[PDB]
Design an enzyme around this catalytic site. Sequence first.
Site, PDB file in Angstrom:
ATOM      1  N   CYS A  96      59.163  60.377  55.859  1.00 14.47           N
ATOM      2  CA  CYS A  96      59.864  59.528  54.547  1.00 14.47           C
ATOM      3  C   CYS A  96      59.697  58.004  55.064  1.00 14.47           C
ATOM      4  CB  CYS A  96      61.643  59.665  54.663  1.00 14.47           C
ATOM      5  SG  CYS A  96      62.365  58.643  53.525  1.00 14.47           S
ATOM      6  N   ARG A 144      63.013  55.223  54.877  1.00 18.21           N
ATOM      7  CA  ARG A 144      63.942  55.028  56.034  1.00 18.21           C
ATOM      8  C   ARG A 144      64.770  53.734  56.444  1.00 18.21           C
ATOM      9  NH1 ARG A 144      61.328  58.413  60.664  1.00 18.21           N
ATOM     10  NH2 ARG A 144      59.221  57.737  59.515  1.00 18.21           N
ATOM     11  N   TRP A 190      65.952  56.732  45.583  1.00 19.85           N
ATOM     12  CA  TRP A 190      65.204  56.149  44.401  1.00 19.85           C
ATOM     13  C   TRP A 190      63.877  56.368  44.485  1.00 19.85           C
ATOM     14  CZ3 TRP A 190      68.353  52.669  47.370  1.00 19.85           C
ATOM     15  CH2 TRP A 190      67.938  52.041  48.161  1.00 19.85           C
ATOM     16  N   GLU A 242      55.192  58.343  43.300  1.00 17.71           N
ATOM     17  CA  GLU A 242      55.786  59.671  43.081  1.00 17.71           C
ATOM     18  C   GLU A 242      55.589  60.265  41.638  1.00 17.71           C
ATOM     19  OE1 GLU A 242      59.228  60.642  45.784  1.00 17.71           O
ATOM     20  OE2 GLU A 242      59.356  58.441  46.076  1.00 17.71           O
TER      21      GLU A 242
HETATM   22  C1  HEM Z   1      66.195  55.411  49.201  1.00 18.95           C
HETATM   23  C2  HEM Z   1      64.955  55.544  48.721  1.00 18.95           C
HETATM   24  C3  HEM Z   1      63.896  56.559  49.164  1.00 18.95           C
HETATM   25  C4  HEM Z   1      62.593  56.217  48.932  1.00 18.95           C
HETATM   26  C5  HEM Z   1      61.891  54.999  48.179  1.00 18.95           C
HETATM   27  C6  HEM Z   1      62.139  57.499  49.739  1.00 18.95           C
HETATM   28  C7  HEM Z   1      60.625  57.717  49.644  1.00 18.95           C
HETATM   29  C8  HEM Z   1      60.076  58.944  50.025  1.00 18.95           C
HETATM   30  C9  HEM Z   1      58.695  59.475  49.509  1.00 18.95           C
HETATM   31  C10 HEM Z   1      57.715  58.687  48.608  1.00 18.95           C
HETATM   32  C11 HEM Z   1      58.562  60.536  50.189  1.00 18.95           C
HETATM   33  C12 HEM Z   1      57.211  61.328  50.214  1.00 18.95           C
HETATM   34  C13 HEM Z   1      57.554  62.492  49.130  1.00 18.95           C
HETATM   35  C14 HEM Z   1      56.664  63.184  48.582  1.00 18.95           C
HETATM   36  O1  HEM Z   1      55.357  62.594  48.648  1.00 18.95           O
HETATM   37  O2  HEM Z   1      56.796  64.239  47.838  1.00 18.95           O
HETATM   38  C15 HEM Z   1      59.803  60.846  51.021  1.00 18.95           C
HETATM   39  C16 HEM Z   1      59.846  62.231  51.813  1.00 18.95           C
HETATM   40  C17 HEM Z   1      61.088  62.461  52.105  1.00 18.95           C
HETATM   41  N1  HEM Z   1      62.328  61.861  52.211  1.00 18.95           N
HETATM   42 FE1  HEM Z   1      62.596  59.882  51.647  1.00 18.95          FE
HETATM   43  N2  HEM Z   1      62.791  58.113  50.204  1.00 18.95           N
HETATM   44  C18 HEM Z   1      64.099  57.694  49.943  1.00 18.95           C
HETATM   45  C19 HEM Z   1      65.361  58.410  50.320  1.00 18.95           C
HETATM   46  C20 HEM Z   1      65.802  59.181  51.130  1.00 18.95           C
HETATM   47  C21 HEM Z   1      67.051  60.185  51.443  1.00 18.95           C
HETATM   48  C22 HEM Z   1      68.270  59.373  50.885  1.00 18.95           C
HETATM   49  C23 HEM Z   1      66.755  61.101  51.965  1.00 18.95           C
HETATM   50  C24 HEM Z   1      67.992  61.877  52.723  1.00 18.95           C
HETATM   51  C25 HEM Z   1      69.093  61.908  52.697  1.00 18.95           C
HETATM   52  C26 HEM Z   1      65.373  61.064  52.468  1.00 18.95           C
HETATM   53  C27 HEM Z   1      64.602  62.021  52.923  1.00 18.95           C
HETATM   54  C28 HEM Z   1      63.306  62.519  52.931  1.00 18.95           C
HETATM   55  C29 HEM Z   1      62.637  63.714  53.288  1.00 18.95           C
HETATM   56  C30 HEM Z   1      63.637  64.804  54.137  1.00 18.95           C
HETATM   57  C31 HEM Z   1      61.328  63.651  52.955  1.00 18.95           C
HETATM   58  C32 HEM Z   1      60.463  64.882  53.349  1.00 18.95           C
HETATM   59  C33 HEM Z   1      60.041  65.810  52.214  1.00 18.95           C
HETATM   60  C34 HEM Z   1      59.251  66.793  52.530  1.00 18.95           C
HETATM   61  O3  HEM Z   1      58.909  66.894  53.681  1.00 18.95           O
HETATM   62  O4  HEM Z   1      58.940  67.686  51.675  1.00 18.95           O
HETATM   63  N3  HEM Z   1      64.733  60.063  51.675  1.00 18.95           N
HETATM   64  N4  HEM Z   1      60.547  59.916  50.814  1.00 18.95           N
HETATM   65  C1  LIG Z   2      65.186  61.817  48.947  1.00 17.18           C
HETATM   66  C2  LIG Z   2      63.784  61.703  48.353  1.00 17.18           C
HETATM   67  C3  LIG Z   2      63.677  60.384  47.620  1.00 17.18           C
HETATM   68  C4  LIG Z   2      62.338  60.022  46.918  1.00 17.18           C
HETATM   69  N1  LIG Z   2      62.156  58.747  46.283  1.00 17.18           N
HETATM   70  N2  LIG Z   2      61.341  60.878  46.839  1.00 17.18           N
HETATM   71  C5  LIG Z   2      61.509  62.205  47.417  1.00 17.18           C
HETATM   72  C6  LIG Z   2      60.595  63.280  47.369  1.00 17.18           C
HETATM   73  C7  LIG Z   2      60.961  64.381  47.926  1.00 17.18           C
HETATM   74  C8  LIG Z   2      59.690  65.280  47.946  1.00 17.18           C
HETATM   75  C9  LIG Z   2      59.222  66.024  49.148  1.00 17.18           C
HETATM   76  N3  LIG Z   2      58.382  67.221  48.804  1.00 17.18           N
HETATM   77  C10 LIG Z   2      58.072  67.561  47.663  1.00 17.18           C
HETATM   78  C11 LIG Z   2      58.359  67.097  46.423  1.00 17.18           C
HETATM   79  C12 LIG Z   2      58.280  67.436  45.181  1.00 17.18           C
HETATM   80  N4  LIG Z   2      56.767  67.186  44.850  1.00 17.18           N
HETATM   81  C13 LIG Z   2      59.465  65.988  46.545  1.00 17.18           C
HETATM   82  C14 LIG Z   2      62.212  64.679  48.585  1.00 17.18           C
HETATM   83  C15 LIG Z   2      62.996  63.624  48.719  1.00 17.18           C
HETATM   84  C16 LIG Z   2      62.763  62.644  48.105  1.00 17.18           C
END
Ligand code: HEM
Ligand SMILES: Cc1cc(N)nc2cc(-c3cncc(CN)c3)ccc12
Lengths: 413, 410
Positions: free
Chosen positions: B108, B111, B280, B285
Amino acid sequence: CPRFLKVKNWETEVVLTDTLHLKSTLETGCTEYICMGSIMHPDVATKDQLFPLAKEFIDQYYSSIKRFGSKAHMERLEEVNKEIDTTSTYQLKDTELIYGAKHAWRNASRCVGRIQWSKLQVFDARDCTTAHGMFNYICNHVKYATNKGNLRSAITIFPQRTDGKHDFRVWNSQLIRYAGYKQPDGSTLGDPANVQFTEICIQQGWKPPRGRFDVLPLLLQANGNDPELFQIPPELVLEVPIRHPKFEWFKDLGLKWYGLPAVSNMLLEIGGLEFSACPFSGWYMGTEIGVRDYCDNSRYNILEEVAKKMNLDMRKTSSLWKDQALVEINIAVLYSFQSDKVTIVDHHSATESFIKHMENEYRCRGGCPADWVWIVPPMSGSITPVFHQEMLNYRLTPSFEYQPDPWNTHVWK
Amino acid sequence: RFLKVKNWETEVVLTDTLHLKSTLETGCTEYICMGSIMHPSATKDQLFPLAKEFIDQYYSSIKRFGSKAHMERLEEVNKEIDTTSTYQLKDTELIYGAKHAWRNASRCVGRIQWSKLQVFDARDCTTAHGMFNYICNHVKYATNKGNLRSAITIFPQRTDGKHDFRVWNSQLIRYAGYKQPDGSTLGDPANVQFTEICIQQGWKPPRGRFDVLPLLLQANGNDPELFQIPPELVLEVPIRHPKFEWFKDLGLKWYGLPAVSNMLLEIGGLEFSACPFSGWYMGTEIGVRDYCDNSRYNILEEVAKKMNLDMRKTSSLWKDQALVEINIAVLYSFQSDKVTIVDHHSATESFIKHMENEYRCRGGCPADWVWIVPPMSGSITPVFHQEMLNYRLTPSFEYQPDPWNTHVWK
Ligand code: HEM
Ligand SMILES: Cc1cc(N)nc2cc(-c3cncc(CN)c3)ccc12
Ligand code: HEM
Ligand SMILES: Cc1cc(N)nc2cc(-c3cncc(CN)c3)ccc12
Ligand SMILES: C[C@H](O)[C@H](O)[C@H]1CNc2nc(N)[nH]c(=O)c2N1
Ligand SMILES: C[C@H](O)[C@H](O)[C@H]1CNc2nc(N)[nH]c(=O)c2N1
Ligand SMILES: [Zn+2]
């Protein structure tokens, strides 16, 4: 380790099975508890150490030509062994050398161009004894590989390492690169990536023209002697002026690049032998020039100037002005190379070939080591098919390795 | 041993010590690196040490390590595992564990925001109706009329595995995908199976391109139940382009709230199989992956056609041009409607800053270069040139199987 390892393609659903990883030789730096996969880089072998490394390689060669266990095989084994026993080293046969080099390319995890691996022209240069001789071999390499714009992959292999006090080295990181000149005011003229080496050349006696695109001299080291400077005949250095098919003003930036990418600072390892000078060349993927050489902040860094001429809003990042200029620059680079009939591949064609390549390898070889962090292009990553492809990374031998810069280790005579 | 990461653009070096604290496995070995694999692959007796580890980390965080409170908490938890085969987190613990599961999410990029998380305790929930109530409250809170707010809702922990709580949707808000009799796909192709599963459960599909899917909710291992999210709670953005008047004519739209609902939260050995979290969006994405993946909305050819681009050779880079334009419209649209969004340049800046914060005050920061680096214009963002060390710290978010592959019905 378990016998089979499976990788998946997340857009086509295709699943491959890897068994080749069982032949992996070196440690990757990764552990059970940490992954160093985005780290750029995570006195000679003794008789005892060399023995099985040579045997490992020789067995592999004879298995490749379907003569494993044959009389010729057992004899070669015996001859290598005597030669190690009495001279502490051994000499490769021409067939082995060619095989070794081809497979070191075949094994290069970080190379997206490996569908071409078996078409490689090998130049045996183990009879070289001086820097002038190295210059002669390098000019022949450049001319053959350039081939008037219809490029051909080649490697030139200089004598192996003996006691380490007699290494052959090409001090240049590539046979052809542009100078960088640090200015008293902090600015850099030319290519900032090459500032250190350029200063070395100047101290070594090079008279710099001090321009933006001055081809650097070769700095060549034979048999452990101090390095010597030579000028590459300018008519051997094919160059492409960069223009844009729509933007007429693009030519007025005065940009060009050289046609032949020839990395010259890596080490080739075959059967425990170390070839510290083995310059090799292919042809460019457009992005290497258009995205990295040109748009990296610490390189030619022209994004700004290009965006200005495009009249883009450069006050917000959310305008994506940078992204927009990057594409146009890369369009120009591909357009100019194709217009001049100089071989170049775009990142779409390259990554599609490589997926096809990787599939064939898994099916005929039982695997294909690949480094996703390097294989995926530095622009438009996810709209290329390698982005969605799972890869396994591991080190097979024969291989290309990094080595320290020679000025850091060289004992000046 | 200490470990160094270098940024090759700034030549800055950071020293990782925090990696010495993990215990989980990454999937690699000394001989094989699996850094690009998406999914590499209790009891009383296992539970207490995991609990003890988390309690220790907690009281260490609030600088009361070895305090009276600490000592008794530990015995309270030992006696409870002893006598119930599990235990229950204090509220403080629940909050600390959730923020740190986010802090430890190596994939992520967002963070820097990690300690700004609104934590919703839904552990008193018993039915699918309750889940639905909890989820509407989450959605309404996190949406905040466009000024989005990070949030997570935590349903009861896994007990025997026979009574899981599950949100079968992968995200709270997604569009439907329909298999067309001629072979093509209407809507979102990533969701076709889930869409058929809802139809099979009695959902009446509008069979349009952007149909918000129902909530399919499972409580206490029971069969799942359908619920319609009240439309006024679903904030959406119509995508238009600041220069290309015809972009709106494509009819494209997306939802403002990314709320992933199919992962599993692990805290001190407890498994929360249902824990929707939201933040958000980063622009790419939606604009790169959601719209332009071939197995997604696959709209590149459409857009490039209106741009009048030469699509006969790949080397004209027409795909790269349409991609940037799509991502411009997406950023423009959200910002115009004052819906929180971040572009991949600003996000990656923030993240490099976060790494520096985290190395300084925590001795490191786990990160997955493969996922951290944006899916377009990679090397013109700062993370491209940043070495990162990946390792798995707990508390954490993990993957779990899709519940329809396991669930025995009725
Ligand atoms: C606040 C703004 C946030 C932004 C801009 C953001 C952005 C992102 C992005 C771009 C990814 C890659 C996801 C993908 O490509 O499918 C990601 C992954 C992830 N985020 Fe964040 N995120 C945010 C908040 C959070 C929050 C609030 C949580 C949990 C409480 C979180 C937990 C995670 C986790 C666990 C992943 C890994 C998902 C996976 O392995 O499939 N994120 N985030
Ligand atoms: C918290 C959060 C915020 C954000 N902006 N994007 C997320 C995207 C994912 C996400 C991770 N793996 C696969 C997907 C579906 N293509 C989505 C999970 C959490 C997210
Ligand atoms: C023929 C067309 C070729 C293409 C299109 C190609 C493409 C590439 C690209 C894009 C890279 C990444 C370079 C960078 O990011 O700086 C690379 C790396 C590499 N290539 Fe290939 N290459 C070709 C030929 C060859 C040949 C002939 C060899 C050796 C015989 C070779 C061996 C390597 C090695 C060892 C690397 C890693 C370099 C490093 O880590 O610094 N390539 N290649
Ligand atoms: C054979 C070959 C072909 C090709 N198209 N590009 C290469 C690029 C490199 C390469 C690796 N690291 C750093 C550089 C210089 N920025 C270049 C080495 C060999 C290459
Ligand atoms: C095979 C590969 O791991 C897969 O395509 C990954 C690559 N990097 C990614 N990075 C992000 N942020 N999101 C993704 O879905 C992926 N997909
Ligand atoms: C930090 C990271 O390892 C480094 O910037 C790498 C990333 N991937 C790369 N990939 C290629 N092809 N070339 C590179 O120079 C790099 N640089
Ligand atoms: Zn690894």
